[PDB]
Amino acid sequence: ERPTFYRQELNKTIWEVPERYQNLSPVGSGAYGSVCAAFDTKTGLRVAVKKLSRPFQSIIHAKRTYRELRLLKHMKHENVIGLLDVFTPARSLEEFNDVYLVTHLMGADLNNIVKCQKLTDDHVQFLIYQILRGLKYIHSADIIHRDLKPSNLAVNEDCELKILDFGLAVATRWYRAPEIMLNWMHYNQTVDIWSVGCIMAELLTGRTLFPGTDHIDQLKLILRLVGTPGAELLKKISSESARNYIQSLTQMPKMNFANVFIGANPLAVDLLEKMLVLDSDKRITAAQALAHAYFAQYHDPDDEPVADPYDQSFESRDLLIDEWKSLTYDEVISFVPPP
Ligand SMILES: Cc1ccc(-n2nc(C(C)(C)C)cc2NC(=O)Nc2cccc(Nc3ccnc4ccc(N)cc34)c2)cc1
Ligand SMILES: CCCCCCCCO[C@@H]1O[C@H](CO)[C@@H](O)[C@H](O)[C@H]1O
Numbered sequence: 305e306r307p308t309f310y311r312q313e314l315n316k317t318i319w320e321v322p323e324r325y326q327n328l329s330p331v332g333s334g335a336y337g338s339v340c341a342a343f344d345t346k347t348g349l350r351v352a353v354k355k356l357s358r359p360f361q362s363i364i365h366a367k368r369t370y371r372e373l374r375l376l377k378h379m380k381h382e383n384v385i386g387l388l389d390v391f392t393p394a395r396s397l398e399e400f401n402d403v404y405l406v407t408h409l410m411g412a413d414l415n416n417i418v419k420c421q422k423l424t425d426d427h428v429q430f431l432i433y434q435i436l437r438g439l440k441y442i443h444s445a446d447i448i449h450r451d452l453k454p455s456n457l458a459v460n461e462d463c464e465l466k467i468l469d470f471g472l473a474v475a476t477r478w479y480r481a482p483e484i485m486l487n488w489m490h491y492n493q494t495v496d497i498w499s500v501g502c503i504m505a506e507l508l509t510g511r512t513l514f515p516g517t518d519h520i521d522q523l524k525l526i527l528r529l530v531g532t533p534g535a536e537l538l539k540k541i542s543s544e545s546a547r548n549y550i551q552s553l554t555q556m557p558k559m560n561f562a563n564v565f566i567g568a569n570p571l572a573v574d575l576l577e578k579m580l581v582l583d584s585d586k587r588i589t590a591a592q593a594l595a596h597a598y599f600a601q602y603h604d605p606d607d608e609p610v611a612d613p614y615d616q617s618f619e620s621r622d623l624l625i626d627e628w629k630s631l632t633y634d635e636v637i638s639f640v641p642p643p
């Protein structure tokens with residue numbers, strides 16, 4: 305059963321992997337892990353192999369390692385990264401200290417595409433349809449991505465898109481919902497839709513919607529488009545500290561998106577309006593967006609599946625590193641590759 309491994313140092317790092325993975329070359333690195341591209345001799349596909357750094361060196365790292373394995377083991381959707389393989393050199397729980405994660409290699413990402421060419425509307429539809437299809441699925445398992453941005457969207461020569469998390473340690477803040485920027489301590493799925501909002505806009509116009517140089521600037525850039533909060537929303541913020549200091553900022557009206565996104569498809573503009581509402585309660589959800597008329601060429605409610613129940617209870621446990629490691633060991637041990 306157990307495969308035979310080989311060994312090589314790549315950059316500063318030891319990479320011990322089953323023979324089937326060949327032609328290893330580094331594609332990026334940092335505090336959360338390193339990745340190599342590689343050829344999977346078993347399938348004939350290019351794959352990405354992620355070695356987690358110091359997976360069990362702290363509690364937080366331990367919980368992070370478990371979190372990522374569990375999440376990735378559960379994801380089974382065309383528009384979301386999937387696990388091809390997870391493996392460890394270790395022969396048992398006691399030797400156990402290294403975790404490798406394997407997925408399809410992604411060609412490249414959506415950020416490249418944006419710069420190197422401008423985009424047709426049919427293309428924009430295709431790209432955004434796929435992101436929301438993926439997000440419907442992720443949101444159905446009560447997972448929030450939280451860091452949707454063009455560099456976490458991998459797209460192939462065929463325009464097939466997968467959502468992932470390229471991060472291994474073009475500001476994230478450019479796509480971040482106004483409430484995250486405010487350290488609102490209980491934010492929800494709609495943060496994701498804000499981000500899709502920022503991406504679509506960018507895909508249509510060619511440039512960053514809100515290219516803020518810091519958190520304060522970011523809110524200024526936003527409020528110039530969506531306008532200062534109104535009373536029905538100020539009523540939702542019962543902090544007197546807040547309300548009175550926002551009202552002391554010179555008012556800013558809501559722009560009409562129709563006068564902003566010039567020469568774009570009316571339907572794109574309407575959808576955007578539904579996504580970039582300041583009040584997260586009023587934003588369109590992923591499920592609802594897939595049905596909007598902008599995606600009539602693509603929509604099919606019989607092919608927009610939801611995720612199987614996903615047990616998240618571990619998130620609210622406070623455990624020992626060896627326990628998180630043991631649990632991660634079980635999940636390695638029980639992995640069944642997809643056909
Ligand atoms: C602590 C933690 C928890 C979860 C994650 N997530 N979350 C997700 C969602 C399902 C929510 C999109 C995905 C991840 N992790 C994830 O994508 N990990 C991962 C695993 C293996 C390889 C890669 N990176 C690459 C994948 C594909 N092609 C690449 C090409 C070049 C390159 N440098 C990296 C990759 C990312 C990441 C970290
Ligand atoms: C170009 C390099 C050729 C490498 C081919 C890798 C084939 C690995 O061989 C495989 O793995 C296991 C041991 O690793 C064996 O038990 C199996 O026979 C086989 O499934």
Ligand SMILES: CCCCCCCCO[C@@H]1O[C@H](CO)[C@@H](O)[C@H](O)[C@H]1O
Binds near residue numbers: 523
């Ligand atoms: C700088 C002015 C503040 C603009 C921030 C917009 C407020 C975000 O919107 C808020 O998101 C909260 C988080 O879940 C929800 O509890 C509220 O229902 C929603 O109104």
